[PDB]
Structure formats: C-alpha cells, structure tokens
Specification:
Chain lengths: 154, 158, 157, 154, 158, 157
C-alpha cells in the first residue's frame, strides 16, 4: 500500500510534469496529483481535465484539487510522501526548506526527481509567455494541452 | 576598545533561527544592536512595537544586546551608531547570492563589513514568512519560535 | 559578418553593462544593444532616455548600435539576421533562470546565448540595486557612467 | 512489488545514512542497501555487519555488496529506482549528472531525499577525521558503529 | 575584420557535448581553434594524436575550425595565435564557480575574455570521464559520442 | 576581550587572505592567524617561511598575531580561550563544504564560524591558482603581497 502525492498548480500541465507523474506512477502503488486552488489562465476544473487526459495510460494515478497545507492534503489520504520534480530554474533551496518544514510538522517525506533533459527547461509560466508571443511550444506540452492553450490565447 | 555589530531584519515575528544568530553575535561582540525595519508600504502581521517587544522578551539574557527600529539605508543606521559591522544569519532557503551582492555594495558605499553565520540545524528551515503560513493553517511551529512569540501569534490568527 | 545582441531593460545602464558591451564589441563584428520595453509597466526612464544614456557611454565603440524592442528576444535577434545573444553575469545573477531561458531560446529559434562574467569592480552593481541605494542617499557614482548618475539623481528628486 | 536501492561505500554508516534507509524502508516495499566494493577503514564484511546491526528494526531492508555499474546492481534485482540522501556538502550537481546518465543507460530513476537537520552535517569521511583527532562524534553514529570506530583508532 | 575563439580541453575522448559547443563557436566566430591539452603527468586513454584525429573526424563539416595541441598557460596559447577569447561549454556537473574563478584570473593576467555556452539538453550529462567509466562496464553511451569515437573506444577497452 | 582565529594553510598568503585579516583585526580585539600544517605533506613553503610572509604583510595590524598548528582547528581555537573562526569567501570557494565544517565545529566544540566576502579585486586569487599560474609564467604580482611574490618566483626557479 505505497503511495505519493505530486503537487502543483499545473497551469497548464507540461511534459515535464507528466514525466514526473509517470515515474511516480511506476514506483509507487498509488499516486495522487494534487492541484492547488490558489490569478491564472485555466480554471481548476480545466487543469484537472488536462491532467486526466494526459495520464489516461496511468491506471494507478488520480487527480484531485485542494487548498491549505500540502501535508494536510497528503495525510488526510493516508499517505506521507511527496514526489517533486526538478528542472532547470527550480528554486531548489526553497524546496529543501519546505521539505524540512513538512517533515517537521507532519512527518511527510519529500522525494525529488529530475525531469528528463528534453523537458528540463519548460515551465508552465515560460510556456505561456512564449506561446503568447507566437513561439512554438508544441514539443513541450501534451497535444491536448497545446490546442487548449491556443484556444485561450486566440 | 569597543567592538560592535548590527543584526538587521523585519522580524515579523522573530524566530529561534534569529535568536540563535543574536546569541552568537552577542557572544562575540561587545555590543549588538538588533535593527528592526520599518516599512511604509508592506505592513506585516505585527506592529514595530510588538516586534521590538517580542525580540526584547526573547533576548532578556543578553545584556549587551539592544533593540532599535529604523528606516532607509542599513549602512546609515550602522554608521550613525558608530559601528561598521553587520551580522547576518544563513538558513536553508537564504538567497545567499543576493546577500553577497548586498554585502559587497554595503562595503563599497560605506565601508561596512558583513559577517555571515549559519543558524543551528534545528532552526535552519524556519523563517518568519513560512512560520506564519504554516500557523495560519493550523500547523504546529511552537518548537521553532520563542514561547511568547508563539502565544502572540496564535492570538493574531484568532 | 559576425554579430551579437546584448539585451536588457537598462533602466539605467550600469558600468557592469558597459563592460559587457565592450567585450562583445571587441569579439563580434557588430553588436546591437537591445533595450527591451514592457508596454505594461513604465520604468524610471523612458525609452529615449535609456537609449540616450547608452549612446553617450558607448560613443567610443564604432561597431555598436542601440535599438529598443518588445516581445520575444529571439524575434528581435533573428529579424536582424543574427543568431547570438551575449549576456553578462554578476553577483546576484539568477543563473538557473538564465540557463532555462537560454535553452528555451535555442529550442524555439536556434539562437545561442553566450555568458560572460563582468569585471570584479562592477560585479555587484545592478540597475535595481543602484536605484534602491541612490533612493536612500547612497553613493553609487563609481558604479554608473557619467551619462547616468546625475540624471538618476534628477529622477529621484 | 515496489522497491529501491540505497547505494554507498558506508565506511562507516552514519545516522544520516540510517535516516535515509528508514525513509526508503517506509515508502517502498523492499529496500536494498548496496555496499560498494572499491583504500578504506572497514572491510566490506564489517561495513555490512554495521549496517545490518543498525537496521534490525527494518524488516523489509537487506544489505548486499556489489561492484561495477550501480544500474546493473539495481536491474539485476528486478528494480529500477535508487534512493539517495542529501546533506550539507553533497555535490548535488554531480549526483544530478549521474542520475541523468543512469536514467539514459538503464531506465533507472533516482529519488533524492534530504537527511534530517540533526544529521545533515555528518559524513563518513568527516566523522573519521574528527574522531581521529579526539572529537566526539558519538551523537552522529549508531552506538555500535561508534564503539567499533574507537576500536579501529585505538 | 577577423574574429576568433579558442575551445580548450583534454577531449579524452571528445563527446557530443563538446561537438555541440564547437558547432556553436564555429557559427559565431570567423575562426575557432580547438586546443587539445597535453599533460605530462596524467596520461589518459587516448594519445594526443588520437584525440586530435577524433576531433577532426567529428568536425569535418566545420571549415573555419582547426585543431591544435598545446601545453602550459591557456591564455598564452590563445594570445600566441592572435586571439583573445575562450569559449567554454557548460553541462550538468560543471564546476561553474571554479570556471568563473579561472575566467576572472585569465582576464586579469592576459586580457582574455571567456564566453560560456550551455550544451544542448540531450548532451548535458555526458562527460569524457563518465563516458569512459560507463563504457568500461558495458554501458551503452553510443548516443552520446560521435560514431567514430564510439568505435575507437570499444577498441581501447578490448 | 573579544577575539577570532583566521585559519588556513597560507602556502602562500594572498591579498585575498590579507583583506580578511584586516577586516577581522578591525572588528575583534585580537586576531590569531592560524597556519595549519599537515605533517604528512610538505607544501611549497616551510612553516617559518609562511609565518614570515604573513608577519611582513601584517606589520600595520597591532592586534594580530601569527601561530602554526595541526589537528583540529577547534582545539587550536579553544586552547587560546577563544570561540570564533573568521573565514573568507572568494570566487571558487566550496561554500557547502565550509558550511558542513562550520556546523560540525559548532557541534563538537561550540565554536562559531563567521564568513566574510573578500574584496572584488582579490576575489579570484587563491594560493593554489596563484602557484599554478606563476608556474607557467603568468603575472600574479598584483594579487600577492610584496613579502610573497618574488619568494614564490624563487621557489619555482
Ligand atoms: O505548493 C504546492 O504546489 C501546493 C499544492 C497543493 C495542492 C493541494 C492542497 C494543498 C497544496 C499546497 C501546496 O503548497
Ligand atoms: O534589509 C533589512 O533587514 C534592513 C533593516 C534595517 C533596519 C533599520 C534601518 C534600516 C534597515 C535597512 C534594511 O535594508
Ligand atoms: O556510487 C556508489 O555509491 C555505488 C555503489 C555501488 C554498490 C554496489 C554496486 C555498484 C555500485 C556503484 C556505485 O557507483
Ligand atoms: O584546461 C584546459 O583545458 C587547458 C587546455 C590547454 C590547451 C592547450 C594549451 C594550454 C592549455 C591549458 C589548459 O588549462
């Protein structure tokens, strides 16, 4: 009965995120993608849909929204592990501070894994920015997500 | 002879990480001034008087440390009090590259030195901002703050 | 034939920037300083002021020119028939973010980014820190070109 | 049937290592501590004994020695995950390079987890050095290990 | 006008990460010299001639790039050839702080500039040393090295 | 009453080190430069040479003294009734390792470590890089005190 939570705002989910989801799904019996309710581009419902569409081939993964402390989200589902992806530009020092705080207040472990090099420079924010000015980010997002992004811009 | 250093911050609220730095500064310098920043824009959770009071309660055993508020250029605060050293603490999550930039700038414009000290591992992941955030949602940060600060913090959230 | 673009908001240009401009001008046949303007946030200096301050402090570099733009840097670069960006490094540079942007810029447009460390004397000035220090009276005269310093004090007063 | 490998030379195992072992053991069904055969202080057999003694309360953990590529060690046991601890002084950039190489050549994922703050500054090398000159490292090593270290020095 | 840069290393053997840097330098400078270090102490896997040959095969499409061996101070190699720029690549695992130190030193003693460029993500985790180590134990690094280098490497291991 | 120890192998002392010595001497009542010797590896300079080069370049600091030692730094510090180390930071400093050692030193002996950044002009010299550069003829005269430079060239010849 192993399991981990993969947190984020995912506005929108990128192939970097999906790579991490797939690795978590391959190494834990159960994975929950935790979508933060927090001024963004997609609604929570749209963000969940896009992740669900992109993870249809991962039977042991589900997608849920949440608010407040991540460790409460994790513990209320009977788990005590977080899997977080690393990419170029991740503020790792801040992630370490939060990992140590999260272990202290709730006994939740955080496992970090590097995203694949091909997806190591995409972020939700940079993808939106580049797409806004007509840059081609189609190789960096799930095909579904890419078309919905184009819709939001145009 | 008379040595001295300034320990700067907003301290909203003071944490055990801050206190650890205060104690080390007070042990190594004849005089220490904790400089509490007043910021006219972003008003935090505690007033400047409340922040000073919380620092004074926490540093009651440090006779050579005093607490003062201030505004503007830190190196002016320092030099106005006849000193020319700043002691700053490092924790997990400190933007150290930015701290180094500011240290080199402060040396250049006013001849003030900056000494960095790492907080104890037990207190290395607390920050004022993260403590407030965790406490707001009912997380237990009582092991990371002075006892009286924790009491006051619970009060401000109700 | 060779050429590079040196990008920034330059609000105002510092001696750190000028050091990088000079090195690029010495190593490439042409250099274009790209003054990138955000149409949705005014800086301290207008575009014409920014360009004027750069021109006055680069007058001894015959192969350097200054132009403003907005939107994607790689479009600015490519529309001028170039394929290289030269970016300075200083103390406090978010290099991980710069690397992310460099890899994205190469991916979307085939543009290369070359980083160069600014001289130690100029390694701790930034436009933002110079403005902050000068706002509260600190002496930044040694860190900014003559074309900038008193104009900066002017804006603050 | 989840599982991970925790690699090292462990010469000797520290409480920082043990903290990582315990977290891996809590989050994966099976954990293998992989002890490198590589000029050190303890023999491979002694290093294994010390880890086994220190992990007696972890029923799903075993300890084995090995040589050559770590990913071959991992894959030959039917697993494809490595759990590696982080401490103050870890050369993380090099660990990331190796993680990306290991994923490329064998499809093995590497999960990084920060050791507890109390154990974040001990290393096998620094513990030996300090102990050699009479420094007290008893709070940083398993009680068994500490006494055997004293034996090797005296 | 005539611009130029030197790309230094031991290249034992050259990798696709190196080649990526070579290609970018050759695209941006009128002339590029790949400088192959001879070290009298630590003799690696390939002789200097073999290393030069492997680089030349890999750079056959770069007419403005040439390969030369050298010894001693890199800035002397650079200045002796009438140049004053070095182009160095960055990958995962590069000791960048040390590279910055050396760049500032090289500017100070000889007025030589150093331009850093990040290798493509696909080639960002290969290094000469790690490629040899993985290959020695039968790992497949053929996607990370030029085709002829891979062939030669398999030969040296038998 | 107050005091700090400035440790290193100082083989040879650089202007980066001297900058740190001067700042410590200005901020503490006494400063001891601790020349740490490895009995199992000879450096370029003997202990007496190292100490002599430091004394000659610190003659204008009346509250600084120079002593050699070996073994645990914290024993050197504590046996002199002190409890503070002052260590310089430069470009290329392995700060993560320095932090690890600082936390260990606090744990085993209660000794505090204060880090200070050396001046930008001296931020890229190290004993090791100065020796390497000078070995192959590079000019490091501006990075080392007069007490060192020609003695260094002497050793290399
Ligand atoms: O930082 C996050 O990504 C985050 C995601 C959450 C997702 C669901 C509930 C709480 C959450 C808290 C977070 O800090
Ligand atoms: O950044 C600070 O912590 C700071 C504190 C001050 C405290 C008193 C006066 C000026 C100050 C300036 C600062 O930048
Ligand atoms: O780096 C290691 O810690 C390591 C441990 C091993 C342990 C057993 C077999 C191979 C191994 C290879 C390694 O690189
Ligand atoms: O570090 C190097 O890669 C290096 C290469 C050289 C190549 C040719 C001549 C001198 C050289 C000096 C170096 O430090």
């Amino acid at each position: 009965m192993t399991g981990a939570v993969c947190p984020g705002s995912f506005d929108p989910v990128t192939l970097g995120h999906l790579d991490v989801f797939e690795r978590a799904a391959a190494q834990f019996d159960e994975v929950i993608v935790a979508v933060l309710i927090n001024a963004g581009m997609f609604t929570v419902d749209e963000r969940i849909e896009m992740i669900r569409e992109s993870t249809a081939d991962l039977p042991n993964l589900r997608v849920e929204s949440g608010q407040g402390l991540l460790v409460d989200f994790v513990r209320e589902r009977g788990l005590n592990a977080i899997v977080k992806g690393l990419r170029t530009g991740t503020d790792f020092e801040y992630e370490l501070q939060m990992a140590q705080m999260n272990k202290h207040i709730a006994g939740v472990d955080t496992f970090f894994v590097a995203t694949a090099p091909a997806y190591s420079f995409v972020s939700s924010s940079l993808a939106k920015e580049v797409a806004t000015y007509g840059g081609d980010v189609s190789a960096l997002l799930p095909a579904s997500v890419h078309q919905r992004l184009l819709g939001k811009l145009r």
